[PDB]
């Protein structure tokens, strides 16, 4: 079912709360135990949610008497038992709901990692693959006024074909990780819409409205009152209409993040949105936001709440993380290795932070495998579609650290085309790697990126920090350069000499030398050092230092600033001063 645009501003019934759950490692409730075939495909299935009729009946499950779990949130941080659980878990709740007239009822999931199978009243309504991207199912025909069984199975088992697959550098947080809600919409409804400036013609707002449901030929209006902008017309059999409409509109900037109130209407459906308007482009080496030359003073960030040691999901998380970005004097954030919860780009639109958004194409994805390609494709489609009206987002990242194979090159070129054909307003990137005295990027996919993005750990994985000053970068003169990652591990309040690895002083030294090395590159235009805050990864098993944390944060797991924070902040204060500009 296509993603409903801007469910963020529709009226919802949250299903959040305490649900029933069963841990099911051998998939006893999903699969025939003898032939491994899902029950879906042919009492026993846990999704029928039966109880006994008579005292001599046998049912080896009972959601009514099962343990409870909080929704939303990762299961891992909810019990020591679930910390390392990689596998399948049944969530069950009940709700009453009477649909008005001939409206449609959707269930909308902000995210759930990794495979989700959803059942209403013992009837399958949908499946989703991808751990971080939203999804919704029309459940209209399968509900009843009282006592609805809602069964959602989430499976986070690592599998060859999944994106990501066997290893990443972050914790496998399983379960329903973001809000779950019912959404009631008219028999015909606004399904999708793009309302952004034309990259070929910034005088015009260019986009479309896509209707869905019972009768798709109806009247559609887009109203931007404060701009005196109006468009209205008829839809045809397709429910789709394109428009190129001109806009005295005040443009969106970090320092001045103007959001226009927008009204989207079709038949009986009314929908309000907050949309900022701006152009992002390349002019040789320069990055131009609305014709003005900018520098991206950025930081990398995982979707994690380190005080909770679990998945971030809320507007409160979004405020705390962005308040830290602002103490660091950032105008930009590189978000995780996956789509974060929609509060991030929504709050970034309001506060004036530019964004980079990424799908988990990470390391050894099975590039030759149609199935893997299909999962990477639906995650990117879902991500670009969700956020294509967000002024804050200026980069879609398609891959991070991928092998230089023919298999791989075609995969990334195909993903580029999928992103471009939905949205052509933003930069297409991929976080790449270098090649070694002097540093080149011969990556053929570097021809295909609007902003040349590289990861590099010269002070940390390759040589000690004195190597940074010895190094000369060799780069195309006609394209912005961007460092999508550099940094170093340090345990907060572990102090010593600057050559003692894992001390704050070593990380401080590394950032100093790293900033001196990058300041020599004339085409440098931004960086998202790794990372703003320590985050969980099961690849980081040094006792006392790591204990399952990646320690490359500028901020500790407790929320305490390390010495390196002040090195980067001071450089960013300097870059703010240099690229300081006057708004029209």
Residues that bind ligand GTR (CB under 6 A): 169-170, 337, 400-401, 455, 485, 530, 550, 552
CB of 227: closest distance to ligand GTR in angstroms?
Answer: 40
Interacting stretch for its own copies, rule CB under 8 A, among 213-221, 339-347, 424-432, 495-503? 495-503
Residue nearest to ligand GTR (CB): 169
Q: What angle do CA 68, 72, 75 make, to 5 degrees?
A: 60
CB of 55: closest distance to its own copies in angstroms?
Answer: 5
Of Cl ion, ligand GTR, its own copies, none, which one sits near residue 86, judging by CB under 5 to 8 A according to partner kind?
its own copies
Please check whether residue 19 is in contact with residue 194, taking contact to mean a CB–CB distance below 8 angstroms.
no
**Which of 12, 23, 369, 422 is the binder for its own copies (CB under 8 A)?**
23
Establish if 258 lies at the interface with Cl ion (CB under 5 A).
no
CB of 502: closest distance to Cl ion in angstroms?
Answer: 8
Distance CA 178, CA 16 (A): 9
Residues near 119 by Cβ (< 8 Å), separated by ≥ 6?
Answer: 47, 49, 125, 149, 150, 151, 152, 153
C-alpha closest to that of 295 among 426, 431, 451, 420: 451
**Which of 65, 100, 580, 582 is the binder for its own copies (CB under 8 A)?**
65
Return the number of the residue (129 or 432) whose C-beta is nearest ligand GTR. 432
Establish if 298 lies at the interface with Cl ion (CB under 5 A).
no
Q: What angle do CA 409, 412, 417 make, to 5 degrees?
A: 125
CB atoms within 10 A of CB 435: 12
CB of 229: closest distance to ligand GTR in angstroms?
Answer: 41
Please say whether the dihedral angle defined by the alpha carbons of residues 183, 189, 191 and 194, taken in this order, is positive or negative. Answer: negative
Which residues 462-521 are close enough to bind Cl ion by CB under 5 A?
A: 489
**Cis? peptide before 531, omega within 30° of 0:** yes
Of ligand GTR, its own copies, Cl ion, none, which one sits near residue 337, judging by CB under 5 to 8 A according to partner kind?
ligand GTR
Q: In the numeric block, which tokens belong to residue 109?
A: 């999931």
Return the number of the residue (58 or 80) whose C-beta is nearest ligand GTR. 58
Interacting stretch for its own copies, rule CB under 8 A, among 124-132, 267-275, 491-499, 562-570? 491-499
Return the number of the residue (79 or 406) whose C-beta is nearest its own copies. 79
Encoded one letter per residue, x for contact with its own copies by CB under 8 A and - for no contact, window 161-200 reads: -----xxxx--x----------------------------
Establish if 388 lies at the interface with Cl ion (CB under 5 A).
no
Q: How many residues bind its own copies (CB under 8 A)?
A: 61
Establish if 551 lies at the interface with Cl ion (CB under 5 A).
yes
HEC states along 221-244? EEEEHHHCEEEEEECCCCCEEEEE
Per the listing, tokens 């000499």 go with: 497
CB atoms within 10 A of CB 274: 18
CB of 532: closest distance to its own copies in angstroms?
Answer: 21
Per the listing, tokens 């989700």 go with: 116
**Which of 17, 246, 323, 403 is the binder for its own copies (CB under 8 A)?**
403
Interacting stretch for Cl ion, rule CB under 5 A, among 33-41, 49-57, 377-385, 549-557? 549-557
Which residues 497-556 are close enough to bind its own copies by CB under 8 A?
A: 497, 499-501, 506, 538-544, 546
Distance CA 216, CA 210 (A): 9
CB of 368: closest distance to its own copies in angstroms?
Answer: 14
For the chain, the residue count is 584
Return the number of the residue (169 or 349) whose C-beta is nearest ligand GTR. 169
Establish if 447 lies at the interface with its own copies (CB under 8 A).
no
**Which of 8, 85, 97, 231 is the binder for its own copies (CB under 8 A)?**
85
CB of 54: closest distance to its own copies in angstroms?
Answer: 8
Establish if 48 lies at the interface with its own copies (CB under 8 A).
no
Establish if 26 lies at the interface with its own copies (CB under 8 A).
yes
**Cis? peptide before 114, omega within 30° of 0:** yes
Give the phi and the psi of residue 142 in degrees, each rounded to 5.
-115, -5
Element (H, E) at 467: helix 467-470
Residues near 566 by Cβ (< 8 Å), separated by ≥ 6?
Answer: none
Please say whether the dihedral angle defined by the alpha carbons of residues 483, 484, 489 and 491, taken in this order, is positive or negative. Answer: positive
Of its own copies, ligand GTR, Cl ion, none, which one sits near residue 83, judging by CB under 5 to 8 A according to partner kind?
its own copies
CB of 548: closest distance to Cl ion in angstroms?
Answer: 11
Return the number of the residue (438 or 499) whose C-beta is nearest its own copies. 499
Residues near 297 by Cβ (< 8 Å), separated by ≥ 6?
Answer: 329, 330, 331, 332, 526, 527, 572, 575, 576
Return the number of the residue (274 or 503) whose C-beta is nearest Cl ion. 503
Distance CA 334, CA 526 (A): 11
CB of 548: closest distance to its own copies in angstroms?
Answer: 9
**Which of 17, 246, 323, 496 is the binder for its own copies (CB under 8 A)?**
496
Q: Would you list the DSSP string of 227-292?
A: GTEEEEEE--TTSEEEEEEE--PPPP-SSS---EEEEEEETTEEEEEEE----EEEETTEEEETTE
CB of 31: closest distance to its own copies in angstroms?
Answer: 8
**Which of 62, 233, 293, 493 is the binder for its own copies (CB under 8 A)?**
62
Distance CA 542, CA 186 (A): 56
**Cis? peptide before 107, omega within 30° of 0:** no
Distance CA 524, CA 579 (A): 13
Q: Which residues bind its own copies (CB under 8 A)?
A: 22-29, 31, 33-36, 52, 55-62, 65-67, 79-87, 158, 166-169, 172, 363-364, 401, 403, 460-461, 464, 496-497, 499-501, 506, 538-544, 546
Q: Which residues bind Cl ion (CB under 5 A)?
A: 489, 550-551
């Amino acid at each position: 079912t296509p993603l409903l645009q801007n469910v963020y501003n529709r009226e919802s019934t949250l299903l959040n709360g305490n649900w029933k759950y069963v841990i099911d490692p051998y998939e006893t409730g999903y699969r025939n135990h003898r032939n491994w075939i899902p029950f879906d495909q042919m009492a026993k299935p846990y999704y029928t949610d039966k109880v006994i009729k008579e005292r001599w009946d046998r049912v080896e499950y009972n959601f009514n008497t099962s343990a409870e779990i909080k929704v939303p949130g990762d299961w891992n941080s909810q019990d020591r038992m679930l910390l390392y659980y990689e596998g399948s878990l049944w969530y069950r709740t009940k709700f009453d709901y009477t649909i008005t007239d001939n409206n449609r009822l959707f269930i909308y999931f902000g995210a759930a990692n990794y495979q989700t199978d959803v059942y209403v009243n013992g009837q399958k309504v949908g499946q989703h693959l991808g751990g971080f991207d939203p999804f919704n199912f029309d459940i209209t025909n399968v509900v009843k006024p009282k006592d609805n069984s809602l069964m959602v199975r989430v499976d986070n088992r690592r599998e060859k074909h999944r994106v990501p697959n066997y290893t990443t550098d972050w914790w496998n947080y399983g379960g329903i990780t973001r809000d779950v809600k019912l959404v009631e919409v008219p028999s015909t409804y606004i399904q999708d819409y793009a309302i952004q400036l034309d990259k070929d013609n910034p005088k015009n707002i260019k986009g479309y409205v896509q209707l869905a449901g019972s009768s798709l030929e109806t009247n559609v209006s887009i109203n931007i009152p404060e701009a005196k902008i109006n468009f209205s017309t008829t839809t045809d059999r397709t429910g789709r209409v394109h428009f190129e409409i001109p806009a005295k509109i005040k443009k969106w900037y970090p320092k001045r993040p103007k959001l226009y109130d927008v009204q989207i209407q079709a038949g009986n459906d009314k929908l309000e949105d907050q949309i900022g308007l701006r152009t992002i482009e390349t002019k040789g080496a320069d990055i131009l936001l609305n014709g003005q030359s900018i520098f991206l003073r950025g930081i990398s960030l995982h979707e994690e709440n380190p005080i909770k040691i679990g998945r971030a999901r809320s507007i409160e998380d979004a405020q705390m993380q962005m308040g830290w970005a602002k103490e660091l004097n950032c105008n930009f954030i590189r978000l995780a290795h996956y789509p974060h919860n929609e509060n991030m780009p929504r709050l970034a639109d309001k506060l004036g932070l530019l964004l980079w958004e990424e799908i988990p194409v990470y390391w050894g994805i099975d590039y030759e495998n149609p199935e893997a390609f299909a999962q990477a494709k639906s995650q990117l489609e879902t991500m670009v579609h969700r956020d294509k009206n967000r002024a804050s987002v200026i980069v879609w990242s398609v891959a991070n650290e991928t092998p230089d194979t023919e298999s791989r090159l075609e995969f990334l070129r195909q993903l580029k085309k999928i992103a471009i054909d939905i949205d052509n307003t933003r930069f297409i990137s991929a976080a790449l790697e270098r090649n070694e005295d002097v540093v080149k990027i011969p990556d053929p996919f570097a021809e295909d990126v609007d902003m040349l993005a590289c990861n590099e750990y010269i002070g940390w994985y390759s040589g000690l920090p004195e190597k940074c000053d010895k190094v000369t970068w060799q780069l195309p003169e006609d394209k912005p350069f961007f460092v999508s990652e550099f940094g170093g591990g340090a345990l907060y309040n572990h102090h010593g000499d600057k050559l003692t690895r894992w001390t704050e002083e070593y990380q401080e030294y590394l950032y100093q030398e790293q900033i001196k090395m990058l300041k020599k590159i004339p085409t440098l235009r931004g960086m998202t050092p790794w990372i703003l805050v320590d985050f969980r990864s099961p690849r980081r098993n040094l006792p006392i230092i790591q204990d399952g944390w990646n320690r490359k944060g500028l901020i500790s797991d407790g929320g305490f600033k390390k010495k390196a924070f002040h090195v980067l902040k001071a450089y960013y204060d300097e870059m703010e001063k240099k690229y300081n500009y006057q708004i029209k």
